């Protein structure tokens, strides 16, 4: 309000309209929630007390709401919008350069009460970043992890990680167009999803989603495929990477597309309905890139582009119609192209996994119809899908009362007995042989007992080598 | 022989089902269904091989009874019976297509209520539920039977005679028996409209119906009244309001003797208590088509008489609750004031305020010394809410029982109410139940605020004393009110032309937000979210606003495309009732009116009045052909007259308004795009469509359109009717089939087939984007804008939900929902509407 | 390993829908419980020995069941009717494998229970008439 009614400054009539809209916005119920005073009808009343001379204040209800560093960005960017409008009129203003300096001092200094907030703000406002700055940010994340496992105070340092990731999501689109780290920040995002915490997972996708968007604008996927780019830069530090894949139970050398999808499938279990739609968009953007490398119309089925279509099967209508089950264009499960025993063992685990935890009629209908048809077209490899399907079907047979959902399950039972009477060629442990023994485990629900999976002792070393190789000094 | 006998079997069996109830009735019906299935196939194959298929009178005399027996089963208690009966309407429909494939010509002429019958099918395909829940769905569909028919008007009467006699048995005799009586009543109410149009079967239904609301029968009396109130309120057909009110009013009018003295009677008190519950539910529910009918009747005189009787009832725990409910009715009667019709709105609102202030008496429960009369607190709480609604926008007017200067009279009147509210305000002070006082005090100030705004001139002086009032919370409100009063101009002053014009300038930009690729999210979203009741208002506002912005083409393309693409029967739906449909109606009526009258009018003088035409019969029907006049003379004259009209229509291509020219193009592109996905000519459908719905209606009955002051003589009328048929055939390029009456004329149409095409193409040839055709009128359209802002405020929350579901791809901060909330709050609540001097009127 | 345990579920659900066994209103308009039969019939083609043996025990248990009352008798009559009708369809449905090594079931498990009905069975004038008619087709 003081800005709108000040004479020292001479704002044109254009600027003053920007401010007045800001004045109204801040009084909406949306911003009462951001500041944390929702359930308060008017702020003025609570701020002041009438009997302030007679008696002292009597605070109570010590129960205190929490704060989310995502809220701070929304406010921190509302203010930044106001300030820039002013700098347009005020010639040679220094406001933004003074504010940045104040943030940059607390951002890179250890203070467990101010550091997280000074990083979410340093990135949201800063206009330039150098390699020397990025190394410090990525080495605050390395020390943050080390503290978590060493000590018993976890939540204290589980916000210094989420703040380092949020900063990086903002500082990358400012990096030099020819820097290696433009690509090495694809493994930071991946190495963060593996920590199994709802906030860390939520922040990790936001870095991933924009990592693809930025690389496109730099035209790096023009003549190469995702697997080629990210797997080429991982080579120098393969030794540390290899060990992680062993414990997480996914492999990237065996099959890239599947490993990348494997992590994203946990997104379907996120409590927030806004992170569910973000992992769907990340799948489309990955699908449209692999096919473009082969000039295959963006919905063709091949070995490369089959993993992302099973994930999009139950959410994208165009995928379902353009890839239809044969026993009602081309039909998923084609045995002409999917003629590799491995490439058809994985594609069944994805489908079995998606139903093991799903609870929805519309989803269970669609997924089982593709599993019956899989039972016949792939008789030999189907026995690797029993334990995953073992428990839930057994319950459905006993108590289900839906003709629409009870038909396909019966088709599954009949196929199994028919193609029995032969010594099992592929056992249930066929997947552990070549790496993906954890694919079904990694997609479980988020653990209520929030704890680092304790294989984070390797994520520290991986990060450490990443710095040493690409940021020598 | 098949139809001679097979049809004659149906006539025997159907007549049996209707006559009386039988144990196996629900079984004969299942068998009757398959017979219908099994005689469609023989007609289907028979028509394919040789259409030549005969329809003797028995085929008609037996088709009726089939319908007369399929309605009367809808109220049958057995759930299976009703479900099966509903499914039997498909086979009654599918037979229509086979006999005549072309939809418009016959499918809506042989079977007038074709569209509704299809709806019965979907409801049948639903999970089974108790008879009550199913009856709700049945009575909804039974209420949409628009067209009178022999089946309808005899299913209504036949079930009436049963209804009448059944009633006597229940009453005269001093549960399953009752349940049937309920079902027959509900059916006989939802479907009342068809038989509409002094002593009549319909009218006798109402009188008997009203003579049951007061039914005092010790045995089952209570249950009868509980259900007649429930039905007449929530289930009566909207085509019967004008008759319900008039009878409802007359019943009351005789409660008052000569010289206007109430005659209290125990039954008379029971009748009013019922007339309040009926009216409240009747008014409360917003349904399709109800609005148009509320206008016809005048509800004023009933309302005034209703209070006086309740006014004199006295004071007691019983009579107080009646006073409460009547007060709540007057609140609901003031939320629909725009729909209702008032002969004198002002003179009526003042009296009600006069009659209601007397009931707000505080501190009367302490003197009464009984907590049982704490209700009197609720009466005061209820009374004020009525007075708030009544006073919102009401100038004062004193009754002229004595003669004084009008201004002097008002100031006295204002002070009368001001002190009354002030006194009630002092009592409510907490120092002198907290929730009760908080609400009542809040209301009493809002009531006072509305009193001042309308009457600043006569009431500001008396009101300044609120500035130094003793209650701090009350002093803030009085200051906020006066902030408005200053801000509003004293005179026109071109103050809204400057302040309001600039203040509300941004509003249209938000509504006219050009969604990328013609999305227009605000308009599209606003369409679905808005309740269907206000579709009339929404249609006019959108069309008017977009025209001012020179973007009408954009709206039509988006709106029509969804409807046409959703339903491949593009033409059929547009003529049907829907939000998209009503858009066309407004477009044609608002702009077409001038074009038609200017063109047709000169020709009408020639035929109607010119001595040269003199007296001649434009008739070629051999049955009606008069021997006096030669057939050749009539045929040649009728053809000659048709040429006059046809030539004028083709020549006047330029005079076509630009608005319709744009309207036709969008349909042309829609069908052309529709064709691509699917030798059909887009112009052919367009030309027939436009001509059939815009040009054709005026010619048939120019008097109703208002072209001609006096109704044309019947002999002149016939020529116009036959003229339309000949003209319409030209558009479809269809010769006279089984129309030997007009076959001689078939020669004439052949030459003009090419000519008709040129006229259609010229309008359809307008540029898709009118870069060259430009008219930068950019009129302010002040009056329309106010309604638009008013509409948005009411549905602020719900329109947000529709926006919330989609648009996840991009943050909504720069998208409608963020912009809507910010701007809408900024402008603040809309002002109350001003009153209407004129009677209720509509498009 | 598992699929054998999958069949048991289809069989086990069969028992709990026999009228004499508590109905529990699991019929779901009989569409749910009728579909189960079709599966039980279909499975027999490849696990003939297993399915048939399971059916015999279900019949044997019903026979050694004592119940009194008009409702009681009607439930058991309709109960045994379904078992026999299903059992015959399995035999007829089974292709002509003509495997004559089913002696184990026939000699002890099956013949004694089918033979029981063929006796006069004068309990019901109208019920026993159908049971003999239905049972004979099985034999
Ligand atoms: Zn009038």
From Swiss-Prot, chain C:
Changing residue 71 to D: In mismatch repair deficient cancer cells. This is Neurofibromin truncated. The chain holds residues 4 to 142 of 2839 of the full protein.
């Amino acid at each position: 309000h003081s800005l709108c009614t000040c004479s020292q400054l001479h704002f044109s009539e254009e600027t003053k309209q920007v401010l007045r809209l800001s004045l109204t916005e801040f009084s909406l119920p949306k911003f009462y929630l951001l500041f944390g005073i929702s359930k308060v009808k008017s702020a003025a009343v609570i701020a002041f007390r009438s009997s302030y001379r007679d008696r002292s204040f009597s605070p109570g209800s010590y129960e205190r709401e929490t704060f989310a560093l995502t809220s701070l960005e929304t406010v921190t960017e509302a203010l930044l919008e106001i300030m820039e409008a002013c700098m347009r009129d005020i010639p040679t203003c220094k406001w933004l350069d003074q504010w940045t300096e104040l943030a940059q001092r607390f951002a890179f200094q250890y203070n467990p009460s101010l550091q997280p907030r000074a990083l979410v703000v340093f990135g949201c406002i800063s206009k330039r970043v150098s390699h020397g700055q990025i190394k410090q940010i990525i080495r605050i994340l390395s020390k943050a992890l080390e503290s978590c496992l060493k000590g018993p105070d976890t939540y204290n340092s589980q916000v210094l990680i989420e703040a380092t990731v949020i900063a990086l999501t903002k500082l990358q689109p400012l990096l030099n167009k020819d820097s290696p780290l433009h690509k090495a920040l694809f493994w930071v995002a991946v190495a963060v999803l593996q920590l199994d915490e709802v906030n860390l997972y939520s922040a990790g996708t936001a870095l991933l989603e924009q990592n693809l968007h930025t690389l496109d604008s730099l035209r790096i996927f023009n003549d190469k495929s995702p697997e080629e780019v990210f797997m080429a830069i991982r080579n120098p530090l393969e030794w540390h990477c290899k060990q992680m894949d062993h414990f997480v139970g996914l492999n990237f050398n065996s099959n890239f597309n599947f490993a990348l999808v494997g992590h994203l499938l946990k997104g379907y279990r996120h409590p927030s309905p806004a992170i569910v739609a973000r992992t769907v968009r990340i799948l489309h953007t990955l699908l449209t890139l692999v096919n473009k490398h082969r000039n295959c119309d963006k919905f063709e089925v091949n070995t490369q582009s089959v993993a992302y279509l099973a994930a999009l099967l139950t959410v994208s209508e165009e995928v379902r119609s353009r890839c239809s089950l044969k026993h009602r264009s081309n039909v998923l499960l084609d045995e002409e192209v999917l003629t590799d025993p491995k490439i058809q063992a994985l594609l069944l685990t994805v489908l079995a996994t998606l139903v093991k935890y799903t609870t929805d009629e519309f989803d269970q209908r669609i997924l089982y119809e593709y599993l019956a048809e899989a039972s016949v077209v792939f008789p030999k490899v189907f026995p690797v899908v029993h334990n995953l399907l073992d428990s839930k079907i057994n319950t459905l047979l006993s108590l289900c009362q839906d003709p629409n959902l009870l038909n396909p399950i019966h088709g599954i039972v009949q196929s199994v007995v028919y193609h029995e009477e032969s010594p099992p060629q592929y056992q249930t442990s066929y997947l552990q042989s070549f790496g993906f023994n954890g694919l079904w485990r990694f997609a479980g629900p988020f653990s209520k007992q929030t704890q680092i999976p304790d294989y984070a002792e390797l994520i520290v070393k991986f990060l450490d080598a990443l710095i040493d190789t690409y940021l020598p000094g | 022989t098949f139809w001679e006998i097979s049809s004659q079997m149906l006539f025997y069996i159907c007549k049996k089902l209707t006559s009386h109830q039988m144990l196996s009735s629900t079984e004969i019906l299942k068998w009757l269904r398959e017979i219908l299935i099994c005689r469609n196939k023989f007609l289907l194959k028979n028509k394919q091989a040789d259409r030549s298929s005969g329809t003797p009178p028995i085929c008609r005399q037996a088709q009726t009874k089939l319908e007369v027996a399929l309605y009367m089963f809808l109220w049958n208690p057995d759930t299976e019976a009703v479900l099966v009966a509903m499914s039997c309407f498909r086979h009654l429909c599918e037979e229509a297509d086979i006999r005549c494939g072309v939809d418009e010509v016959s499918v809506h002429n042989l079977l007038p209520n074709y569209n509704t019958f299809m709806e019965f099918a979907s409801v049948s395909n639903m999970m089974s539920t108790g008879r009550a829940a199913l009856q709700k769905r049945v009575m909804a569909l039974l209420r949409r039977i628009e067209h009178p028919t022999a089946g309808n008007t005899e299913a209504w009467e036949d079930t009436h005679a049963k209804w009448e006699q059944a009633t006597k048995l229940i009453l005269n005799y001093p549960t399953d028996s009752l349940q049937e009586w309920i079902n027959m009543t509900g059916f006989l109410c939802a479907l009342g409209g068809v038989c509409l149009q002094a002593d009549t079967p319909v009218s006798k239904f109402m009188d008997r119906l009203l003579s049951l609301m007061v039914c005092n029968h010790e045995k089952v009396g209570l249950q009868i009244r509980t259900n007649v109130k429930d039905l007449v309120g929530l289930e009566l057909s909207p085509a019967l309001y004008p008759m319900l009110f008039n009878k409802l009013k007359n019943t009351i009018s005789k409660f008052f003797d000569s010289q206007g003295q109430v005659l209290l009677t125990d039954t008379n008190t029971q009748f009013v208590e019922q007339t309040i519950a009926i009216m409240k539910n009747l008014l409360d529910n917003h349904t399709e088509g109800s609005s148009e009918h509320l206008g016809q009747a005048s509800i004023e005189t009933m309302m005034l008489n209703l209070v006086r009787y309740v006014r004199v009832l006295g004071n007691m725990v019983h009579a107080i609750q009646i006073k409460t409910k009547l007060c709540q009715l007057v609140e609901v009667m003031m939320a629909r004031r725009d729909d209702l019709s008032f002969c004198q709105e002002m003179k009526f609102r003042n009296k009600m305020v006069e009659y209601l202030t007397d009931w707000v008496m505080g501190t009367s429960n302490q003197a009464a010394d009984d907590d049982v009369k704490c209700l009197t607190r609720d009466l005061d709480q209820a009374s004020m809410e009525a007075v708030v609604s009544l006073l919102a926008g009401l100038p004062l007017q004193p009754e002229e029982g004595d003669g004084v200067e009008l201004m002097e009279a008002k100031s006295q009147l204002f002070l009368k109410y001001f002190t009354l509210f002030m006194n009630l305000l002092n009592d409510c002070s907490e120092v002198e139940m907290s929730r009760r006082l908080a609400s009542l005090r809040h209301c009493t100030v809002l009531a006072m605020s509305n009193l001042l705004n309308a009457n600043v001139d006569s009431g500001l002086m008396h009101s300044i004393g609120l500035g130094y009032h003793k209650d701090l919370q009350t002093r803030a409100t009085f200051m906020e009110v006066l902030t408005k009063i200053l801000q509003q101009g004293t005179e026109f002053d071109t103050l809204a032309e400057t302040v309001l014009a600039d203040r509300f300038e941004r509003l249209v930009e938000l509504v006219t937000m050009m969604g990328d690729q013609g999305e227009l999210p605000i308009a599209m979203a606003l369409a679905n979210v808005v309740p269907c009741s206000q579709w009339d208002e929404l249609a006019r506002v959108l069309v008017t606003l977009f025209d001012s912005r020179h973007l009408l083409y954009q709206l039509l393309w988006n709106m029509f495309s969804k409807e046409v693409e959703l339903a491949d029967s593009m033409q059929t739906l547009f003529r049907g009732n829907s939000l998209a449909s009503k858009i066309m109606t407004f477009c044609f009526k608002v702009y077409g009116a001038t074009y038609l009258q200017k063109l047709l009018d000169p020709l009408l003088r020639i035929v109607i009045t010119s001595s040269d035409w003199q007296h001649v019969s434009f008739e070629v029907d051999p049955t009606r052909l008069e021997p006096s006049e030669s057939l050749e003379e009539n045929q040649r004259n009728l053809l000659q007259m048709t040429e006059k009209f046809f030539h004028a229509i083709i020549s006047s291509s330029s005079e076509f308004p630009p608005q319709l020219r744009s309207v036709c193009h969008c349909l042309y592109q829609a069908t052309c795009h529709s064709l691509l996905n699917k030798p059909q000519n887009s112009i052919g459908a367009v030309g027939s469509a436009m001509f059939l719905r815009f040009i054709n209606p005026a010619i048939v009955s120019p008097y109703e359109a208002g072209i001609l002051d006096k109704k044309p003589p019947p002999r002149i009328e016939r020529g116009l009717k036959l003229m339309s048929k000949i003209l319409q055939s030209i558009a479809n390029h269809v010769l006279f089939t089984k129309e030997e009456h007009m076959r001689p004329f078939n020669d004439f149409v052949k030459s003009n087939f090419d000519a008709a095409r040129r006229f259609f193409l010229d309008i359809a040839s307008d540029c898709p984007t009118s870069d060259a055709v430009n008219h930068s009128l950019s009129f302010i359209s002040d009056g329309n804008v106010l309604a638009l802002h008013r509409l948005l405020w009411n549905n602020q929350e719900k329109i947000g939900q529709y926006l919330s579901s989609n648009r996840d791809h991009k943050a909504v901060g720069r998208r409608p929902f963020d912009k809507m909330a910010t701007l809408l709050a900024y402008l603040g609540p809309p002002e109350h509407k001003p009153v209407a001097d004129t009677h209720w009127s509509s498009l | 390993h598992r699929p054998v345990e999958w069949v048991q579920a289809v069989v086990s659900r069969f028992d709990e829908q026999l009228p004499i066994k508590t109905g529990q209103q699991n019929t779901h308009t009989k569409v749910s419980t009728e579909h189960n039969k079709e599966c039980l019939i279909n499975i027999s083609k490849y696990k003939f020995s297993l399915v048939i043996s399971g059916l015999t025990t279900i019949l044997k248990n019903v026979n050694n069941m004592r119940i009194f009352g008009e409702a009681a008798e009607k439930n058991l009559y309709l109960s045994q009717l379904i078992i026999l009708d299903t059992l015959e369809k399995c035999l007829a449905g089974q292709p002509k494998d003509t495997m004559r090594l089913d002696e184990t079931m026939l000699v002890k498990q099956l013949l004694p229970e089918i033979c029981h009905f063929l006796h006069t069975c004068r309990e019901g004038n109208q019920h026993a008439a159908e049971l003999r008619n239905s049972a004979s087709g099985v034999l």
